[PDB]
Symmetry: D2
């Protein structure tokens, strides 16, 4: 009763134990300031097109997985408004490049919880029953309840999407993988503002027999999802 | 004439550490996973075929950094990827992938059971071997913090700054750096003191550090470190 | 320049390094449902006076520590409204005794974030700059950002107050202690609805040369606080 | 006869485990810190002046539970409180308190360095010694989860239910139970298979488990467990 998604370097999940009850989609950090028109990333002159590219593929995956009753998780990078959870180095670096965390930006205080720019874009907005992880690190597990939630939901398999490929997506995948979760990265459902780093982050997954999991795409997923 | 207790290493994208608080008592070198099976002649990677040279390249630069930091009384930490001999800490997926490529964790290899604690091939190579007082982290994950006492040890030693070296750049080195960075540690990657199975992935992992004002920390090299280390 | 508070079994903190910048008060779980008139604990017929007894001493400590610019932290036990962070056993036990987590109670859904009964009582309410930890376990560190926050604030010493002595107070103290924090329990600033368990939890702290830290009282603290 | 795959142990305040899902593959015994120095002459606990009879009392009941659970193929886990020999994992306060009462961690004792890994007094007593395949957790905290791989191991073994035994009831046993419970594990404390430095603290720690509908789990005894274990 095994089901697999075509993937590289191996058909996923490794053991074919692919069910709604043990599998989650995670949509990482699809926040206005990071990928929306007029957000701080746009205003900083970064290559915003590369982080908008995954929106439509993600929307298709999200619709398909909702329809089939899979677990859906979303994440938002951000800090408490009093900045208690903000490391001094993280803050200093952000100030040095003119995107200081907690400072005013075009859509509110940058990377600050409760602000408009920090929220998820409307095109990928959560619905009730889809857990949202608010995380202060680049890996979504650090200092959050993500692992607790995954464990109570008895999730074994994680399908990763979102931004950026080389930062929060890769870090969260690595954290999950170390703990035993079986992870699939959808290459057309992630992006970074450096395309080379996007492609390299994906390549890294596949090495050594799928060191961090396996890689597929939205069409292959939607076609074969049970 | 004018003396300062702030000290920096020339680094990219910013001089490191960010605040110049660079002292023996708050700074550690970490040498990641310089183990025989991974970089050594006759280990399991060698027995599979062609190319150890990329993961051996950092040995001499690491040795220079290690010697310099020992002489100046900096904290020195080493790590080893590996599993309990009964494999209780080995996830099923990790095991299955390693079996599928012919390097099954816990399976017999030319230097003992692959990635298995206590076996000859699993140990750190003699030329970078720890000495007394240099903590060794035995880790079952690619990130050295997961399921270990690394963070507890760092905190009791009041370590603020970490200098990362070892192998592989894109796997255990990058994962450990990301975990440390998230927790507030200030990290420097020495680019000539790491290497990977694919040189392009090595270079990309280094580039990733530098983006967005040094998202994971900063990058330097052994010569710049040794020259400016207080 | 060492400063100590009189305490049992040793003067606290162990090394006398007692400063506003390295020391936090933590006020644990002083929530309406747990200690307020008409909350679920009151309606169940427990002896509410034992968990109200610490309010006035806590107020005195809180005022003194605010005035001197010490770090102030508050905690609230609770669950996400969709109960994603609620273990099945925790839920089942609560249902079995007629205080089901997430079920309707006299002040709103029991132990559910955002509900009236779940919030901190008005007499001990946080002010801006005082971090609040929302925790799904009895130990406030589990699945939260408390440790991350303590580390960024460079906190070494923790003064524990709140309720209940034997559950969240003792558990949070034990977690902190294991990680190297130096902890003081203020015995008149905690309570439980079984006074024997309160007293025993306090006794446990002092054994073996102060296995979990040291114990004092609000008067001794306020008198000697630098 | 009507047969069921739900099975319960008579326990207080509720029959355990809550859902009756009690099988060898999902259930572990954990034997906490039955080490020579906690329950034998010359140890840490001995140096503090406590009465050894209270911590020896659980030996025979634990032995019976251990034998029964081994025979039925249940998971068996053991723990040892202790520190790396260089004391890198030893908080300064923990060390200072132990020195103040004359049982300094790492100081020489009649059975080796107190609470120091690799020393004779730190090892598990022979009457409860692990066998191959029984994971041992070496922990620097009073809660066995802190800074260890216990959680990772539990998760890879798909353990849901934990039966706790060992010493001391109010310190490492209670702390480990609370950590497990918070993470969703379903825990049973065997009251005749634990003991403490003060019998009243033992009894109170057990009572604490039962309050509020079994806030930390449920409580039973060796005879009830062995009688009903599937």
């Amino acid at each position: 009763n095994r089901h697999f998604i075509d993937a590289d370097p191996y058909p996923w999940p490794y053991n074919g134990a692919l069910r709604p009850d043990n599998t989650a989609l995670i949509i990482i950090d699809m926040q206005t300031d990071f990928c929306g028109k007029g957000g701080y990333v746009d205003h900083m002159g970064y290559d915003l097109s590369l982080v908008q590219a995954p929106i439509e593929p993600i929307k298709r995956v999200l619709a398909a997985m909702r329809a089939k009753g899979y677990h859906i998780i979303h994440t938002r990078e951000g800090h408490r408004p009093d900045l208690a959870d903000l490391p001094a180095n993280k803050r200093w670096r952000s100030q040095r490049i003119g995107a200081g965390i907690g400072d005013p930006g075009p859509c509110g205080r940058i990377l600050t919880r409760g602000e408009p720019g920090w929220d998820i874009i409307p095109e990928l907005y959560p619905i009730e029953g889809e857990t949202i992880i608010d995380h202060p690190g680049k890996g979504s597990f650090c200092a959050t309840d993500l692992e607790l939630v995954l464990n109570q939901k008895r999730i074994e398999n994680i399908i990763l999407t979102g931004i950026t490929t080389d930062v929060c997506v890769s870090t969260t995948m690595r954290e999950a993988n170390d703990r035993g979760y079986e992870c699939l990265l959808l290459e057309d459902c992630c992006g970074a503002t450096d395309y080379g780093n996007h492609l390299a982050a994906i390549k890294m997954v596949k090495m050594q027999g799928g060191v961090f999991g396996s890689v597929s795409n939205s069409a292959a997923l939607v076609e074969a999802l049970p």
